[PDB]
Design a protein around this ligand. Sequence first.
Ligand SMILES: OC[C@H]1O[C@H](O[C@@H]2[C@H](O)[C@@H](O)O[C@H](CO)[C@H]2O)[C@@H](O)[C@@H](O)[C@@H]1O
Ligand SMILES: OC[C@H]1O[C@H](O[C@@H]2[C@H](O)[C@@H](O)O[C@H](CO)[C@H]2O)[C@@H](O)[C@@H](O)[C@@H]1O
Lengths: 110, 110
Amino acid sequence: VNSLSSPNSLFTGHSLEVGPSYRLIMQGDCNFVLYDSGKPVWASNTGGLGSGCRLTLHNNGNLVIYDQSNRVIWQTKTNGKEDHYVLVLQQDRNVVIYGPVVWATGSGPA
Amino acid sequence: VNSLSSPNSLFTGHSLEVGPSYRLIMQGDCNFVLYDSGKPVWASNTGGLGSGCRLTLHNNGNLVIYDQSNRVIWQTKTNGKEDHYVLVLQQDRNVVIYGPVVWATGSGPA
Ligand SMILES: OC[C@H]1O[C@H](O[C@@H]2[C@H](O)[C@@H](O)O[C@H](CO)[C@H]2O)[C@@H](O)[C@@H](O)[C@@H]1O
Ligand SMILES: OC[C@H]1O[C@H](O[C@@H]2[C@H](O)[C@@H](O)O[C@H](CO)[C@H]2O)[C@@H](O)[C@@H](O)[C@@H]1O
């Protein structure tokens, strides 16, 4: 999967991936990093600032990293209209937050 | 991959997938269908209306299916602000168009 929809989280050790070289991972050392064939090309630069951290995209568009103590250690500060948003690791290697909802099939949640 | 970012297209026979059971495919018979473990649960209902068809998400948020003759055979008619949008097959099985851009790492296009 290469997307994370609000208000869900990407937990410790989990990643968004776009084969065969792109991996955006919420690391166990709290750093949120994008690797291109093993080389880090973007990151929140929060390594060592915690453990058991998670990445959460909120229903207002704000992206945040919480540590084990459930505290904020990094955020995009993009507080907009209450709706639904999505974070996407794209095939062009860009990582983007899109929203609000424009249209939906309604085939889910199911 | 389970997303399509504007202004790109999903060409004939190609799909967005969220393992292990969700498959959203632009079929060779021009129908755009979402299958859950082989069972169709949503579709544009455009089968038989063309061949060599493609699904395109525009930079204004409109989602369209063009036939081989490059004509419109189905669309969401969601014409909004000029920016960038994304179509996503979610793990909760919903298919959603999100936009405009809220934030981006700028790690792409690369
Ligand atoms: O509409 C797109 C939206 O659908 C699902 O969210 C639900 C809808 O917003 C609506 O049915 O209200 C529900 C809460 O009562 C809400 O969960 C999800 O698939 C969501 O991700 C999607 O953006
Ligand atoms: O900003 C998010 C956006 O980035 C990339 O699109 C580019 C930007 O809009 C900006 O750099 O202008 C470019 C055209 O001059 C445009 O391509 C893509 O990654 C896009 O999908 C993403 O939404």
